[PDB]
Structures are given as structure tokens and as C-alpha cells.
Amino acid sequence: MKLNIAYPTNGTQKMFEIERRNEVRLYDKKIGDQFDGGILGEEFEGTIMEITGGDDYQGFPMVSGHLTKKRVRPLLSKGDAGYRCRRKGVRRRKSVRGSIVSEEICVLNLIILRPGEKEIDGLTNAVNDVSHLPRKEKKLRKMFGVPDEEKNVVGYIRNILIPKIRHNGKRMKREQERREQIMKIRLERKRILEEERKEYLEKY
Amino acid sequence: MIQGVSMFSGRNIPKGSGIYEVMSDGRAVLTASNKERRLIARKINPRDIRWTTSSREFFGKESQYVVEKMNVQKVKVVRGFRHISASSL
RNA sequence: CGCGGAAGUGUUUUGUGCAAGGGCCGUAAGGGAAGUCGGCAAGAUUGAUGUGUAACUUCGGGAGAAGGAUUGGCUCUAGC
RNA sequence: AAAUGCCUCGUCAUGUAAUUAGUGACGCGCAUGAAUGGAGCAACGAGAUUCCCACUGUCCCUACGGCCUGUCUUGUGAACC
RNA sequence: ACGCUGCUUUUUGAUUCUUCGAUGUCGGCUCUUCCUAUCAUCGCGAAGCAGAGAUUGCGAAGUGUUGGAUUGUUCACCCA
RNA sequence: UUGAUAGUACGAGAGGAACUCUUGAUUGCGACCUCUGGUGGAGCGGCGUGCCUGCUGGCUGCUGCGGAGCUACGUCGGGAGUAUAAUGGCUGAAGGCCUCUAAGCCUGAAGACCGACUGCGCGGUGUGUGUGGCGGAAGACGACCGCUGUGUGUGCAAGCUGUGCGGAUGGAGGAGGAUUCCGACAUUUUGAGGCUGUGCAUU
RNA sequence: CGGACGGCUCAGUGAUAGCACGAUGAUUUGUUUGCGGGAUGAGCAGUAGCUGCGGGAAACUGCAGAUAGUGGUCUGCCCCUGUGGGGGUUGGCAAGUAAGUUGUGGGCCUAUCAGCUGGUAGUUAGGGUAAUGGCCUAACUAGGCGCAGACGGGAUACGGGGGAUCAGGGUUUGGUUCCGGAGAGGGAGCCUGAGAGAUGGCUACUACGUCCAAGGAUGGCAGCAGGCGCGAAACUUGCCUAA
């Protein structure tokens, strides 16, 4: 079974491969059951790996919450592994597998939790790029440490160096105005009301 | 070599010792002996028989699926994005 | 009555441990009268209490027709 | 074509994969027939027949088990021919 | 074709030699063995034998030749 | 009997084979118990009727599972030896030709004989037997196979049944001052108790 | 936000539907109108698109990385109480529009259809509902309908607005433009939503099926054209950013 290993700390993946002598040691292990990497081959020694998923020979995925080695067919809804929902309120019966490894799984998905003293080529060397930069202003301030009243938070960072910086600048200003005149109207409604109470209470 | 697992008692069956029974829906259940096919015919629930494994984990004598496997692992190295490779904050 | 107990009454203390074939019995996969002159023999139904009961008929019967259901132990309630 | 029809396993229909059996219909009936009683079946029958459901070692095809005999000992000790 | 010559002992007759001071008289079921005048299987001829399918002849008796409906039937007649 | 040979030879067409190789079975015969099924008055459990004053524990009845052994509905196992029959051929006269035949020779059958396989008598040879007792893989009784004190008992291993008595904490409800008594059954101590003719060790 | 309307059809239904006059003081209502109402606090979790590694004949789908909206929990706010406490997280009022529930009355034919009915008629309590009610359950009473036709059975039964015939009085007909109902091969059960027991939504059984590498995956013309079938019996696979 070809393995699909990933190192989250460096953010990198690559497709590995093993033979059916060490393959038989993986059987009867749950999703989230993980072990020492030396069992698989040689270069994986001294590592701590982890199991997270896998497919079978027909494409169907393994999901948690079933605890069987056979193929089931439940009724799944929006937010469920095994279904990709498009209409609102719709549910589908669709086949999946259980959370236990056996001779049916075609590909395993793993996780390098602690590297070893050796050097796996495409995983322990590179350090890949992040993809997005934060947009919330509290989170932006804690990334670079701009606590000086922050005075203009984007312009502060543009000088510290070209990288373009997007941010929720406009969205803070719309809502800032919306709940400022809403206080303006609460005064008019109340003020214009008590004039009529007294003027009404005058005559009668 | 194992033939399969008993669908009533939960125990491993040696190669050449069970009988598969296919039902009308296409479901093939595997049993070990006539001690077990009789309990299915009478409609007894396996959790009321103390030598089965579904009865030992119902009463908490011993769970049949150990999980955790000691899983003591943490690391959070930081990386760069496109040109800010050396942030130095 | 059957299935078990009293009372009264009767009774011995150095043969073997069990081949084949008999006499009287018990249990059997899957099939279900293909057996035989012939369902011979065996198997099957069976007590009680609700339910539900056809053709025909000398109007009395047929009738317990057929067919379906319930049943232990324990702790209480209601009637006279 | 009946417990009564020789010819005869009569002819037609129906039940079966297959019907010298059973039932229905036909009638020149060797030799049916009216207290020699004729026609007729409600109720009753350890009476004679054919089929259906149920059920099974009747059978396919036999196996294993129980008790008493037989096999072995002592005593008593015949008969048929 | 019209005529003519044989063999067997499975038919039914013909006869009355044995048995009437008793040889248990039909069929089926069960089990063994023998014959060849061979149905199939093995070898080989002929043809009005193209091939296929059959028909006719010779050597050959080692091995096989079933399950049912109706009848007591032998026999018969149908189904697979 | 399956596949190949082969939609080939043969035939205007329609149709449609064989030698050699290869796959499975039906039935007969002779064995065997690893597996599966049957039996199992051995063993353990459940539910009852009567009796021992009741509980515990017994005996008696019906029922579930059921090891060893036995068994079939289960598993295993078949000569290319020699000479011939019918027929077809070689050489060859009688009969200057002809002819498988008169002398000779070649080939050829689920048949014959032989081999292999089982039983019995008789022979030979550097060759002659444990009285009794106790066991079994052997057995109606005789016999046969073994030893010549290595049994019995117990422990462990390997199995069958299925969670023991007593205690503690609960229980549909009922009874009534004590915060007591009656109650089928439940959970826990507890894959627990009971049992074994098989194997190993020891005494 | 919408796809619950619009469009098609007449199987079921003889009155539980439809028409006429009533009750809702027994009920809910997005969009529309006019008034009211509104957390810029803390502290943690964490996702679509996007950037990479991939599975499968297909139809469809997984894992890692990093981010808006967002989701918990405290804090405050509001509600029922108070000489204790306990809940909720901003949801309103009135019109208009729509919808649900309910009372009485009407010439299809038939007595070779005369007696029918067990949740059946009522009382008392509770549950459920947006809401009354045997609608449902527990206990108890013995009722309810009928020649002024009950209860049954039949024929080509969707109801009206309407059509035909024609001195008057009558007889016959309405699948079909408008309004009301019911259904999407046959039965059932449901999710989302102000509104559906929805079928150009989902799940199961059932009639007929279709595609596959054989392990799986899938269908719904009584919408507009069109094809087959059936029968005596019925049009174009056209053009449209205009009304």
C-alpha cells in the first residue's frame, strides 16, 4: 500500500511506498492510533508517526465513528466526512469504510510527529511558505507586536522591511458609522415623545 | 492462518473450522460451532453470556479496542511566507 | 385414574461384564411416501379459558365443525 | 360397465410428468327393475374405497447408544430322531 | 416370392415311466453363479460410404445394462 | 465428459469430423479420522414432581450443550510385460503367368497368459520359544502383541461446561414506629466453580 | 432571496369535495405599510474559496497547511421571584394579505339491499396541537341512527360558473377557457422553511428497468416539441433580449 506522508511543522508532503512484508504490521489499528516509524522501513526510525485517513481500492474513504473493517452506508448530512452538500437541508445515503486498517486500504495518510536523527529527503529539509496572513487587527498586532496605540496598524508594518498586506480596514469603518447614528435616532424618538405627553396632559 | 472472527462470541476461528451461512439479503455470517448457532436460533442476546467479548466490555470487564498508544508529541517551528523569510519579531 | 409416598407384608450376602445374531426401547444431516398389494409401523394432535365457526338437513342437528390466540414465578388491586 | 356388463384395460371428459385405479356423463342392459322390494345419505359405523393438508428412519442408506438374552462358570438335568 | 432342408428346449400340446403310510403348490423382495443366438463399450469388413448421422457383416462374454405412474400379477403400456 | 485440434479436412451450399495433448466427474474395490456432520445411561448447566422440618446439600423426572471412541453425509489410492483372433500386408511355388500360404515372415483386441497384490502347504539355515503374574494398539472362548516391580495416587499441560457457597449494595410493592420486618430476581467479589479415561513429570 | 406560484391531467372521491348563508370570544401569518426595539466587552476554539499531496471504469470523494464571517465560555443586559433563588440571550404592537379549523341545507340509479354501529354515543381528568374536538389515552355510564330510506351494492361520477333543445310547464348534459379540489408508476415515512407530508427534494419496500473494467453506480414527459403502442378516433423535434 502506497503511503502519503506529511510533516506539518515544515508543511510538506510526498508519496512514499512500501512492500507487503512490513505492510502486515499495520493491521488492526484505529484512526488516531500511532506508533514508532521504524516498523515501515528503515529511514523512518526514531520517529513518531500518526494515522489520519485512507481510501480503498474503489475510492471510498475511511471515516471515524464506525469501528468496523467492512463497508457501511449511513445517511449523512451537511458537515460530514464523505458528503459534499449543495442544497439546503438535503441528506444522502453514501458508502464509507470503518476506522480500522486491513488488507482493503489502498493508501494510508500519515503524520510525522517527531523527526529522527536521520534525514528523510523531501520532508525534513524544506520549509515551505505560509499561504495567508491574518486580517483581524488584534491578531495582526500580536504577530509583529505593534502596541504603541497602533495609530495606523497597516502603515506601521509597511515601513518595517514588496509584500502586499490586505486587511479588514473598510469593514471596521462601515459598522463604526452604523452604530453611531443609531444612537442619534434613539434621542429624537424619545425627545419628541415627551413633548406630546405633557401637551396631551395639559388639556386633559 | 485465521478463517475469520466469530460473529456471536468475538473470537478468532482457525483455518478450516467454521460454517458460513448466507441470508436472503446477501449477508454471510460466520459462526464457530453448534453451541453458537443454537443461541442464535433461540434469539438470545450475546451480552447476557459472560464468556463472549461483547459481554465483557458491556460490563466493563475489559474493553476490546485499545486506542491511545502513548501519543506524546508536540512541535511548532515557525516558517516564512514569500519574502519575509527572516521575520525577526 | 395416571405420576410419587406411608402402614402392613416379602427378601439375600463368594458365577461373568458384557463378539456376531436376536427380544423390548432412544437419538439422527439434507430430502419428505420416491417405500409398499395397501401410509403397515412410527411420528403427529391432546388439558383449560377468550375468539371464530360452512355445505347440507328428518329443523332436533351437523359442532369440540374447520381456523386462529393465551398459559410460569413474584408483589399487589377489585367483586361477594 | 354399479359388491349386478361376457366382449372389456367399452367410449368421451376430468385429477398426474406419466392413470388396468377414482369421480362425472353416455346406454339394445351376455344376465338391471319395483315388500324377490325400486329410487333415495340427514344422523350414526374398530365396515369397503380414492384424493388433499399435516407429519415422520416407510424409503434414498444407514450410523451410534441403553437394558435383558447369547458368549464364559457352578448346580439340577430332558426330548424329537 | 413360389418351393425345399435343418437346429434349440425358452411356448403350448401329445403321453402316463417315477412319487398318493405327502418332495410345501403363483409373483415380488434378497443373493450368487453360468450360457451366447452381442444391446453398449474395444478391434476390423461392405455399400446405391463426399462429410455428419445411421444401416448390414465378422473376432469378442472382461465390465456394465437405472429411477417412476396404473395392475396381485408374469405380461403390457406410457413418463424421465 | 471440458478445452484445444477447428468453423479446419469434406461440400455448389446447407452443414461439419479425426489421431495426438488436456479438464473434471459417475460407479465398483481397498483403506483412514486432520477437517465437517451424526451418536455420546461420560461430564457440567437449566427447569420441575414427590420425600428428608425450611435455607444450604441430596435422591428421583424432563431438557441444552456435549470431549474420547465409533462412523458417512467427510478425506486418500491403479502394468505402457510376452504371445495371439478377425482383418490388412511381405517373400513365394504348385500352375514359365497369377496369388497374404502350401515352407517361412511382419503387424494387430475392453480378450488369453504372465507380472504386481492377498492366502495356504512344503523346504533350507553359524538360528528353537518366560512357569506364573500384570497390561494393550489384540480379543466371544482359545489365540496374538508387549514387559518382567515403574504401577496406583497427586501436580502441571491440554480440553468441556459456563460465572459456585457466603457476604455486601439494590429490588415491583406491602406491613407499621423499629427506621424495623416480608420479597421473585439483579450487580459485584468471580472467564468463577465443577469435571476429564488424553500428554508430560514425580512419588 | 426564490424555486409551496406558474404549467399539465381527471385515477380516487356520491359528500369528509363543491355552491349558498354563518362561527373563529378556539388560531398562526415571510415580503407590504405606520410605530417601537438593537453588546462596538473579555478569553479561547476554529471553516469555505485559496496553496500542495492523492484515490476511483465511473458517479463521486479524502488528508496536511494557512485565513474573513463564525461557534462556545465568562462579563454585562433583560424575565419570573425575594427576609431563598431560578431561567433566557433579543424574538415587539396595530393594520393589510394569506392559511387552518367548524354549523345547517340541496333529485345519479337501486328494497331480487331492512334493520345497522365497539372509540361506537356520552361524562370526568390529563396529553398533544398554532388552535376547539374521541383527535389520543385512563376511569366510569349505555347510549347513537332508521320507510321523511338507515346500513349496503351498482353505472363511462372530479364539483360549480356554464351548454344543448324550445309556446308554456319540462328533458338532457358539463374530461375541456374562469374559480375550488385532488394527484405526479404504486404505497408509506420525513428534512429545510413564514408556507410542503413537495416529487424538474431526500429515505425504504414494491412494478418495470438502465450503465459497468463486475466492485459498484443509477431512472421517473398526467411541462413544450417528438417517438412507440393502442384504437373508429386527434398538428411543429419551427421563430422570439418585442406585447
CSV table of C-alpha atoms (C1' of nucleotides) in Angstrom, one decimal, chain G residues 11-118:
chain,number,residue,atom,x,y,z
G,11,A,C1',-57.1,7.9,-11.3
G,12,G,C1',-59.5,8.4,-6.3
G,13,U,C1',-63.9,10.7,-4.1
G,14,G,C1',-71.9,10.3,-4.2
G,15,A,C1',-70.4,14.0,0.2
G,16,U,C1',-65.1,14.3,4.7
G,17,A,C1',-65.3,17.5,-2.1
G,18,G,C1',-68.1,21.7,-4.2
G,19,C,C1',-72.0,26.0,-4.1
G,20,A,C1',-75.0,29.3,-0.7
G,21,C,C1',-75.7,31.8,4.0
G,22,G,C1',-73.0,31.7,9.0
G,23,A,C1',-69.0,30.9,13.8
G,24,U,C1',-63.3,31.6,14.9
G,25,G,C1',-65.0,35.4,22.1
G,26,A,C1',-60.9,28.5,19.6
G,27,U,C1',-55.9,30.1,15.8
G,28,U,C1',-50.9,31.1,13.2
G,29,U,C1',-49.1,34.6,9.1
G,30,G,C1',-42.1,36.0,5.3
G,31,U,C1',-42.2,40.0,1.6
G,32,U,C1',-46.1,45.2,2.2
G,33,U,C1',-47.5,49.8,5.5
G,34,G,C1',-47.0,53.0,10.3
G,35,C,C1',-44.9,52.9,15.1
G,36,G,C1',-41.3,50.6,18.7
G,37,G,C1',-36.5,47.8,19.6
G,38,G,C1',-30.6,46.9,18.7
G,39,A,C1',-23.4,44.5,23.4
G,40,U,C1',-18.7,48.0,19.5
G,41,G,C1',-16.8,43.9,26.5
G,42,A,C1',-13.1,40.0,28.0
G,43,G,C1',-10.8,34.9,26.8
G,44,C,C1',-10.2,30.6,23.8
G,45,A,C1',-11.6,27.2,19.8
G,46,G,C1',-11.9,27.1,14.7
G,47,U,C1',-14.1,26.8,8.4
G,48,A,C1',-15.3,27.8,2.7
G,49,G,C1',-12.6,29.8,-1.5
G,50,C,C1',-7.2,29.5,-2.0
G,51,U,C1',-1.7,26.6,-1.8
G,52,G,C1',0.2,21.4,-2.1
G,53,C,C1',-0.1,15.7,-1.9
G,54,G,C1',-4.0,11.9,-3.7
G,55,G,C1',-7.6,7.9,-4.7
G,56,G,C1',-11.7,5.8,-8.5
G,57,A,C1',-14.0,2.5,-15.0
G,58,A,C1',-17.4,5.6,-13.4
G,59,A,C1',-20.8,8.5,-10.2
G,60,C,C1',-18.4,10.9,-6.6
G,61,U,C1',-14.7,11.8,-2.8
G,62,G,C1',-10.1,12.1,1.2
G,63,C,C1',-5.6,14.2,4.1
G,64,A,C1',-2.0,18.3,5.5
G,65,G,C1',-1.2,24.0,5.6
G,66,A,C1',-2.9,28.9,6.4
G,67,U,C1',-7.1,32.9,6.8
G,68,A,C1',-12.9,36.6,6.9
G,69,G,C1',-17.7,35.5,8.5
G,70,U,C1',-18.5,32.3,12.7
G,71,G,C1',-19.2,28.9,17.4
G,72,G,C1',-18.5,28.1,22.9
G,73,U,C1',-17.5,30.0,27.9
G,74,C,C1',-17.2,34.4,31.4
G,75,U,C1',-19.0,39.8,31.9
G,76,G,C1',-22.9,42.6,31.5
G,77,C,C1',-28.1,43.2,30.0
G,78,C,C1',-33.4,41.5,30.2
G,79,C,C1',-37.7,37.9,32.7
G,80,C,C1',-40.4,35.3,37.0
G,81,U,C1',-39.5,35.9,42.4
G,82,G,C1',-37.5,37.7,47.2
G,83,U,C1',-36.3,38.2,54.9
G,84,G,C1',-34.0,31.9,49.4
G,85,G,C1',-33.3,31.5,44.5
G,86,G,C1',-34.3,30.1,39.3
G,87,G,C1',-34.3,30.9,33.8
G,88,G,C1',-33.3,33.4,28.9
G,89,U,C1',-29.6,35.8,25.1
G,90,U,C1',-33.4,39.9,21.9
G,91,G,C1',-37.7,37.2,19.3
G,92,G,C1',-42.4,43.5,19.7
G,93,C,C1',-47.5,46.2,18.7
G,94,A,C1',-51.6,47.5,15.2
G,95,A,C1',-53.4,47.2,10.2
G,96,G,C1',-53.2,44.6,5.4
G,97,U,C1',-52.5,39.9,2.7
G,98,A,C1',-52.7,34.6,3.0
G,99,A,C1',-53.9,29.9,5.6
G,100,G,C1',-56.1,26.3,9.0
G,101,U,C1',-60.4,24.6,11.9
G,102,U,C1',-66.0,24.3,12.3
G,103,G,C1',-72.6,24.5,12.0
G,104,U,C1',-77.3,23.8,8.8
G,105,G,C1',-79.5,22.9,3.7
G,106,G,C1',-79.8,20.6,-1.8
G,107,G,C1',-83.5,14.6,-7.1
G,108,C,C1',-77.2,9.8,-10.2
G,109,C,C1',-79.7,4.6,-10.2
G,110,U,C1',-81.1,0.8,-7.0
G,111,A,C1',-85.5,-3.0,-1.3
G,112,U,C1',-84.2,-9.9,-6.2
G,113,C,C1',-80.4,-4.2,-0.1
G,114,A,C1',-84.5,-3.9,6.5
G,115,G,C1',-82.5,-3.4,10.4
G,116,C,C1',-77.2,-1.1,11.4
G,117,U,C1',-73.0,0.5,14.9
G,118,G,C1',-67.0,-1.2,19.8
